[PDB]
């Protein structure tokens, strides 16, 4: 089955504090009201340019790599004790550090955010991982699966610097007018 994305999968584009300002930026985002493939109870999926992942203990982790064998590949397996991150042929790299969302994208960037008991609403995502490893990824294996596209967004910051609303600048003509006017409310005309 399929599901609409509603308004989900918006992270912090950069690490610069802002407050009470309407900022417009361009980056890879999950388009609003987009179809997300549904999986339950598990084959491989293409990576393309960034993947959105969301699920609702049983989940083990995620693995990345073109052949997923003979060439270098990613390996990110979570653990009850801490977390295990290593990269080598199957080393070349090692590292240890309701609703669960992840915005894995490709160096390697990871964002995460957990919310109490897909729902309708808005909630941002904060960055956690910025490991500098460079290698191609084409296939992904490990819920719901999303994808990223290069669409500009309009972001709204409250007084404390927390994102509370956003506009998809390429969704509808009303959204285009909102982005052009840099306002969330449009007067008659």
């Amino acid at each position: 089955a399929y599901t609409n994305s509603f308004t989900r999968g918006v992270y912090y584009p950069d690490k610069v504090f802002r407050s009470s300002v309407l900022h417009s930026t361009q980056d890879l985002f999950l388009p609003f009201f987009s179809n997300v493939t549904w999986f339950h109870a598990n084959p491989v999926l293409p990576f393309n340019d960034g993947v959105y992942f969301a699920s609702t203990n049983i989940i083990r982790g995620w693995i990345f790599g073109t052949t997923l064998s003979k060439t270098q590949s990613l390996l990110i397996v979570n653990n009850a004790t801490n977390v295990v991150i290593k990269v080598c042929e199957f080393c070349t790299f090692e590292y240890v550090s309701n609703l669960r969302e992840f915005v894995f994208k490709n160096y390697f960037k990871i964002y995460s955010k957990h919310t109490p008991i897909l729902p309708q609403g808005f909630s941002a995502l904060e960055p956690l991982v910025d490991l500098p490893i460079g290698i191609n990824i084409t296939r992904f294996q490990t819920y719901y699966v999303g994808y990223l596209q290069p669409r500009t967004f309009l972001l709204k910051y409250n007084e404390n610097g927390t994102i509370t609303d956003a506009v998809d600048c390429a969704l509808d003509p009303l959204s285009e007018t909102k982005c052009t006017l840099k306002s969330f409310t449009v007067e008659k005309g």
Binding site: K15, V16, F17, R18
Partner: protein
Amino acid sequence: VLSFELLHAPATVCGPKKSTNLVKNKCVNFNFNGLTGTGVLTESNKKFLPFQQFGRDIADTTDAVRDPQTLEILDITPCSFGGVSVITPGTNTSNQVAVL
């Protein structure tokens, strides 16, 4: 071949330079692993996320900066400045002036 990027991300490599102590409420030319500028440094109460270092405003200007070593947030304000106007009568009558 050496290639740089000079991005605004948290710096990792630097020159062999040294470091001094912080001074507040005095017009100084700060240099925090780059980012040269002049202004008055006070204590900023703005809430920062654990991954948030640089502050910005409607027109940028980098109003808030976090300490690299001690890891403390600060506020940046430009030093006071303004024009000067001279108020005088005609030189025929007298030659005394008052400035504004």
